[model samples]
Target: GSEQQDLDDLAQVILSAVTSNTDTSKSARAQALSTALASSLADLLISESSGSSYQTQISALTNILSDCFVTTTGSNNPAFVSRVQTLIAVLSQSSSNAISGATGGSAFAQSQAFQQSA
Candidate 1:
């Protein structure tokens, strides 16, 4: 599924973006990379929602997004700025407590916003 793929791709993009752009002296970027991957991996390995594996992955991702992505502790590069904004758009849409892996609506809105923001 596209959502599954985006999860993986965005995981890498956000991780590399943070690692390559940020100057975290306390492993915040490391934490971000771990969470992003956890989310991606969780989404990929679960479909029924009854597995402990699924819960673990989502929890990691939620922590990363909740803690690192929103923090302004990273470099001010275009990639960082873009992905941070993208992640915000992601959270803003699903901030309603309706948790899931598919973020197409949020992604589309983020893309449109990015286009408009430019």
Candidate 2:
């Protein structure tokens, strides 16, 4: 239940940060959300050692993180892009250590392309 709750909170944080027009507010929210995501991922990896039950949750979290990339590209904020890249890298490393079928690898690759394009 904590994982699901974290996902919901993460989704909301991403939505709020992306929708805000103020860069300062967005930056603060992004930092907070990334911290939350990283811890949540670590917890998920520990609790769901089998990985089967958390696949969908991982997918949802990946999509939620992708929203930051999409918004960063649209806004063309190099600063925000850098933050998103850090977030992706953290998730990528965490997933790589524990899950075989997660999308963190793809998300990290996408962030690389996104960084270059930005």
Candidate 3:
């Protein structure tokens, strides 16, 4: 349940950052997207809860975001838009794998079990 929650949260957070924005300039929107990307990457790195299968992918994703965020500018740039799409798709993949691994149980099979069943 908790693991699924994390995956859901990741999707919710990233989508909200994109889907809810309006009236912001192209540059502003790009900045916001970059900022969101950094936050997501940081979450994955700090939690390290995404699991081993996701570790390398997460690192690569992080680098992509970090690099793109630094160099990306202008709203009309198709490359910037494309990069954002790429980021979301990969982010989803990593989160999906992480959730799948934890689906072994309600939380995790080895997670704190009740001392005894009543």
Top-TM-score candidate index = 1
Query: Candidate 3 vs. truth: CA RMSD?
Result: 13.3
| TM-scores for all predictions | 0.30, 0.28, 0.27
- Report RMSD for candidate 2: 12.1
In the range 1-94, model 3's lDDT, one tens digit per residue, is 3333443344344334333333233333344444444554565566854533243433344333334434333334334344445664665564
Pairs in steric clash, model 2: none
- Give candidate 1's root-mean-square deviation (CA, Å): 10.1
lDDT of 2 at 83: 45
TM-score order of candidates, top first: 1, 2, 3
Task: Kindly list the per-residue Cα lDDT of model 1 for residues 18-110, writing each as its tens digit.
Answer: 556344532454555555455555554665422222434443443444355455633233445555556645544553322344434434444
TM-score of 3: 0.27
Which 10 consecutive residues of model 2 have the lowest summed lDDT? 109-118
Model 2, range 6-115, lDDT digits (tens) per residue? 34444443544354445434444445455555655666667753333343443444344445445443433333344443544564454444344443333333334533
